[PDB]
């Protein structure tokens, strides 16, 4: 078994954790507290550690500078699972600042964090990699996630590191300094992640609002969508998949030009409030949903821009004759840049989910990520040029040359992605 350690950092990493881990538990027949039920199915070792007798342990670390995300997760949302021995808890907020988790406060925990990580590493014969789940734009996550990631890679350089970067939406709990924290942290992800997936909560919001369900939106719907995305993305690493049997393969399939590792994803079905009743999806429709605009959890349209890589990972019964004919319907939409002579890869793994006949996700390496970046960069520059809110970072140690450097690396990254279109 090639195993993965999962680290949850900051508010979204930790608020997601209970949904993510509950879903995995059901997928493998783990009865929520680690108790085995029925028969274990899937490669359970990849995400759960063995108790001496029976019980399974999520292979996780929960890191939060403020005590609240962790306290409700371990006392109210999922008991006797996220063992306190593996929680790193601070006693102060970040005041939403990047700086706090990277330079002035979160740094005092790095001894503790790296010690706990090694303790997880030491229990496994074959690491495949690390996955760090975090909010981008929220100081604790924006700060610690790249601090942690960098510390790991200089110690375990041969492992693939993947991050799940969640961009806060404006109808949820965002800070007024979101644009600052966002590019200050993209700047570090660009130098430490091997694979980084960006999921935009504003698209989750837009899709649900489009459905006529905006008045039902709450943290729980966002957490369910985000958790399902993690489960499906990670799903091919939990079974005997034909597409991505390892994070090492994902790196090869998804990022052929190492700096451009930021990915966009899509899913179908989406289940707002879990009341969607997707009683039947035909194979042909599943692929059309995955390409269609309203299932992309990012502000991009597949009809614009270019692809560098595109992997369609389906679940359940998806005959290949249909998949191959269906893909031709993408002829006027899915265009790859002629710097990389690739093709759309598509195949499927099994479901242990009894409610959906079939489902699936896509991973896209697509130039449209540049538009998410440019939006944030424009906001950054507009605020930065008038020093709005910059004093708060300077007093924590962020010498202003740091802001200029972040601006330059993201403008350069944006330029490089758009260049693939010319």
């Amino acid at each position: 078994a090639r195993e993965v350690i999962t680290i949850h950092v900051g508010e979204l990493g930790i608020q997601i954790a209970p949904n993510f881990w509950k879903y995995l538990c059901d997928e493998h027949n783990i009865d929520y507290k680690g108790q085995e039920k029925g028969k274990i199915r899937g490669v359970i070792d990849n995400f759960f550690e063995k108790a001496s007798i029976g019980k399974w342990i999520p292979r996780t670390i929960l890191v939060d500078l403020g005590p609240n995300a962790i306290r409700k997760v371990t006392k109210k949302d999922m008991k006797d699972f996220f063992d306190p021995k593996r929680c790193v808890m601070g006693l102060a907020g970040d005041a939403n600042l990047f700086a706090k988790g990277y330079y002035s406060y979160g740094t005092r925990f790095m001894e503790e964090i790296m010690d706990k990580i090694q303790k997880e590493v030491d229990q496994t014969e074959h690491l495949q990699g690390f996955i760090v789940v975090h909010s981008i734009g929220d100081g604790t996550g924006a700060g610690l996630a790249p601090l942690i990631m960098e510390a790991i890679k200089k110690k375990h350089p041969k492992l693939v590191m993947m991050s799940y970067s969640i961009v806060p939406s404006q109808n949820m709990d965002c800070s007024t300094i979101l644009p600052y924290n966002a590019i200050l942290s993209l700047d570090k992800l660009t130098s430490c992640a091997d694979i980084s997936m960006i999921i935009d909560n504003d698209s989750i919001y837009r899709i649900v609002a489009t459905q006529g369900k905006e008045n039902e939106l709450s943290e729980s719907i966002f957490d369910q969508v985000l958790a399902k995305a993690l489960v499906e993305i990670t799903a091919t690493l939990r079974f005997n998949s034909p597409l991505n049997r390892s994070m090492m393969e994902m790196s090869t399939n998804l990022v052929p030009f190492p700096r451009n590792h930021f990915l966009m994803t899509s899913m179908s079905p989406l289940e707002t409030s879990l009341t969607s009743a997707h009683q039947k999806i035909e194979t042909k429709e599943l692929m059309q949903d995955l390409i269609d605009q309203d299932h992309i959890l990012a502000p991009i349209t597949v009809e614009k821009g270019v692809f560098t890589a595109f992997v369609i990972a389906l679940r359940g019964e998806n005959p290949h004759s249909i998949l191959q004919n269906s893909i031709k319907g993408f002829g006027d939409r899915v265009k790859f840049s002629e710097i990389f002579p690739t093709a759309i890869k598509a195949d499927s793994t099994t479901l242990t989910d009894e409610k959906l006949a079939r489902s699936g996700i896509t991973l896209m390496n697509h130039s449209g990520v540049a538009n998410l970046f440019q939006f944030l960069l424009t906001q950054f520059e507009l605020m930065y040029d008038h020093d709005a809110f910059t004093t708060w970072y300077y007093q924590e140690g962020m010498q202003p040359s740091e802001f200029e450097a972040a601006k330059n690396n993201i403008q350069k990254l944006i330029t490089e992605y758009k260049q693939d279109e010319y």
Partner: protein, 422 residues
């Protein structure tokens, strides 16, 4: 963690705060007569300590006059435990300089010993809140030295003040323009944020919205208490935006030295069950952002906002909130440097007197109208050395009050210039 210590200084401070403490006790299911739990709800621990089944408000009660603090035992009684009650000598008053320099070395030390005790009992300080008069004697004099001292001892702990600016409609003690600037200067130098309330606005609100023919000091306090209660509420009762004091500074203060905030709340109720039916989001947002409910003598619709924060307390639909707030954005100008900065949040817990209440805070360039009037009153008296030697023998030199004015003028000038365009 994220706990708040509250310091009440002077008469105005103790009466306003006393009213605050009674309202907050009601909301959290605490019987204010003795601190006993009724059915406790919300994040009680942010403002109350707990011993046994008694909730103890983490207040420091300060005056110079023996009687003012001693008589709290009759007005509020058991609500404020005696260990927090500090006063001394024979009292002092009606002169900033006296409160600031003649309070007694022992008097200030006792205040600080109590502050430290409240702090050591607390898991992690999220900030300090002070309630005080900006004029008179004790509230401005001793209160400003207290403000100064606290920041020196706790350099990174944000301090919020609720402060009351004087009005000639109420007080004949026209030495006040001197007191008003000396304390404003210290607020500029040491507070992280401050809520500018004044009695000219509160008085006219009482006359026109509470329908009081001749507002009493107690009606002014009623309105103030409602503002403090509902403003503070964003920190303590759930909510969709996950705020703390450090976070409020980050969201509402784009520049240091420009941290003076306006506050507005509605509906207002004249101390009885006058409330009726239910207000819609539209009429309620309109009141809050109108000039008529601003609790500072400003006319904010004519200015420009750097930032704003609007809390809806009660059962309001997301779609009505968003339509109502879209109307506000169209009608009241914002500085475009901040592409964000207007944060809307809601909390499911309504205030005790209504189905839905709305609270707004913000940075509006017209806030300086208060400061400009104070300056004018000061200039008429100051250019004539109205009261040089009084202040000369209490330890202040002309250069110090000139420094105070220079700083105040700098803030005024920066607000006018900063928001001139965008």
């Amino acid at each position: 963690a994220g706990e708040i210590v509250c310091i009440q200084v002077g008469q105005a401070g103790n009466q306003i705060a006393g009213a605050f403490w009674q309202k907050i006790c009601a909301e959290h299911g605490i019987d204010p007569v003795n601190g006993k739990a009724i059915d406790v709800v919300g994040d009680t621990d942010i403002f109350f300590n707990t011993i046994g089944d008694k909730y103890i408000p983490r207040a420091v009660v300060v005056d110079l006059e023996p009687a003012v603090v001693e008589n709290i035992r009759e007005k509020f009684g058991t609500l404020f435990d005696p260990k927090s009650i500090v006063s001394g000598a024979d009292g002092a008053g009606n002169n900033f300089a006296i409160g600031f320099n003649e309070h007694g070395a022992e008097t200030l030390e006792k205040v600080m010993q109590v502050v430290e005790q409240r702090v050591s009992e607390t898991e992690s300080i999220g900030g300090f809140i002070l309630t005080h008069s900006c004029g008179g004697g004790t509230g401005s004099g001793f209160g400003s030295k207290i403000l100064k001292t606290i920041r020196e001892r706790y350099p990174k702990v944000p301090i919020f003040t609720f402060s009351i600016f004087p009005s000639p409609k109420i007080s004949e003690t026209v030495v006040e323009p001197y007191n008003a600037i000396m304390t404003l200067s210290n607020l500029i130098k040491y507070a992280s944020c401050s809520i500018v309330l004044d009695n000219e606005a509160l008085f006219s609100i009482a006359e026109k919205k509470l329908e009081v023919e001749n507002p009493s000091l107690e009606d002014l306090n009623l309105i103030i208490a409602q503002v403090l209660t509902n403003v503070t509420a964003s920190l303590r009762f759930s909510g969709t935006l996950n705020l703390d004091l450090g976070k409020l500074v980050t969201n509402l203060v784009p520049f240091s030295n420009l941290h003076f905030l306006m506050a507005s709340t509605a509906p207002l109720v004249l101390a009885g069950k006058e409330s009726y039916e239910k207000m819609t989001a539209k009429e309620l947002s309109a009141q809050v952002f109108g000039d008529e409910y601003i609790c500072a003598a400003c006319k904010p619709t004519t200015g420009r906002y750097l930032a704003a924060s609007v809390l809806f307390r009660g059962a309001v639909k997301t779609s009505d909130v968003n339509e109502a707030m879209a109307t506000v954005k169209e009608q009241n100008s914002f500085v475009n440097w901040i592409p964000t900065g207007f944060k809307i949040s809601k909390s499911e817990t309504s205030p005790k007197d209504s189905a839905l209440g709305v609270i707004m805070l913000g940075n509006n360039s017209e806030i300086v109208s208060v400061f400009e009037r104070i300056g004018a009153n000061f200039d008429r008296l100051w250019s004539r050395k109205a009261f040089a030697h009084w202040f000369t023998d209490s330890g202040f030199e002309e250069k110090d009050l000139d420094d105070a004015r220079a700083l105040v003028q700098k803030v005024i000038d920066d607000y006018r210039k900063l928001t001139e365009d965008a």
